Design a protein around this ligand. Structure first.
Ligand SMILES: O=P(O)(O)O[C@@H]1[C@@H](OP(=O)(O)O)[C@H](OP(=O)(O)OP(=O)(O)O)[C@@H](O)[C@H](O)[C@H]1OP(=O)(O)OP(=O)(O)O
Ligand SMILES: [Cl-]
Ligand SMILES: [Cl-]
Ligand SMILES: [F-]
Ligand SMILES: [Mg+2]
Ligand SMILES: [Mg+2]
Ligand SMILES: [Mg+2]
Length: 135
């Protein structure tokens, strides 16, 4: 749980777009920890010397309770306001696990969204995460 930073002081993060299938039509969002009535893309801090693709798959397992086939890097996304920089990967979900770390610890929720509905729920407090789906 040691946080890591780029040379400019931005916190290093990684996340996955967790799709239900190779068609990439439905994506898994999780509940905000700060405001559980809101939705976010699962993701978190890279550990020291941790590869970004390893951090992304690890945080998705912790927060969303899913595993799958890692796909492409979509891009690297800055949040200027919050000073963090996130590597975002495609993950094709193949395992959905019950009683995952954040379900047990903080009652985190998860739900499938069609892409256009994910963009809608992310826009208000997570516009950069909404922008993950622009491509
Ligand atoms: O986005 P939210 O779930 O509301 O809260 C994030 C938190 O995310 P989680 O608690 O993991 O969902 C970030 O942690 P991050 O994902 O970067 O790292 P780890 O997963 O812990 O490795 C913190 O850094 C950040 O401060 C919090 O945001 P906030 O409490 O300011 O709330 P808000 O979402 O209303 O801006
Ligand atoms: Cl899908
Ligand atoms: Cl963000
Ligand atoms: F975390
Ligand atoms: Mg986390
Ligand atoms: Mg997180
Ligand atoms: Mg973490």
């Amino acid at each position: 749980q040691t946080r890591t930073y780029d040379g400019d002081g931005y916190k290093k993060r990684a996340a996955c777009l967790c799709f239900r299938s190779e068609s990439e039509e439905e994506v898994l969002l999780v509940s905000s920890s700060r405001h559980p009535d809101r939705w976010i893309v699962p993701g978190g801090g890279m550990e020291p010397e941790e590869e970004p693709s390893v951090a992304a798959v690890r945080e998705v397992c912790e927060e969303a309770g899913v595993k799958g086939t890692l796909g492409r890097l979509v891009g690297i996304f800055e949040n200027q306001e919050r000073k963090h920089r996130t590597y975002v990967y495609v993950l094709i979900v193949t395992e959905v696990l019950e009683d995952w770390e954040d379900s047990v610890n903080i009652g985190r929720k998860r739900e499938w969204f069609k892409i256009e509905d994910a963009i809608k729920v992310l826009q208000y407090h997570k516009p950069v995460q909404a922008s993950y789906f622009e491509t």
